[PDB]
Structure 1
Amino acid sequence: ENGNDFAALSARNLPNVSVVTSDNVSVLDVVSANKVLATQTALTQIEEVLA
């Protein structure tokens, strides 16, 4: 969602994971992957910027 960084500072894992906020979701950073995790607030935030 936003600067709850304590949930990103544990995303330097095996590159099986990669982290990104809800303002930078691009095309590739979704198409390149298979499953997607997202908190409940990030869903609504996405559903805002995307009008």
Structure 2
Amino acid sequence: ADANEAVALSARNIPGVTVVEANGINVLDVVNHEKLLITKAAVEKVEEVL
């Protein structure tokens, strides 16, 4: 939703994982990464922005 830091620090070293906040999603990092993990709050934020 709004860039919590514990999740950003973890998975920073895992070689295939990228963490972004709600207003950072864009076409390349959605198409490129096979799977999408999203929190229920980020779903609401993306829905209300668009």
Fold match (TM-score > 0.5): yes
Question: Percent identity of the aligned residues?
Answer: 48
Structure 1 length as normaliser, TM-score? 0.83
Structure 2 unmatched runs, 5+: none
Q: For structure 1, which runs of at least 5 residues remain unmatched after alignment?
A: none
TM-score by length of 2: 0.85
| Moved segments of 4+, more than 2 Å | none
Pick the structure with more helix per residue: 2
Deviations 1:16-37 (A, max 9, x none): 1111111110000100011110
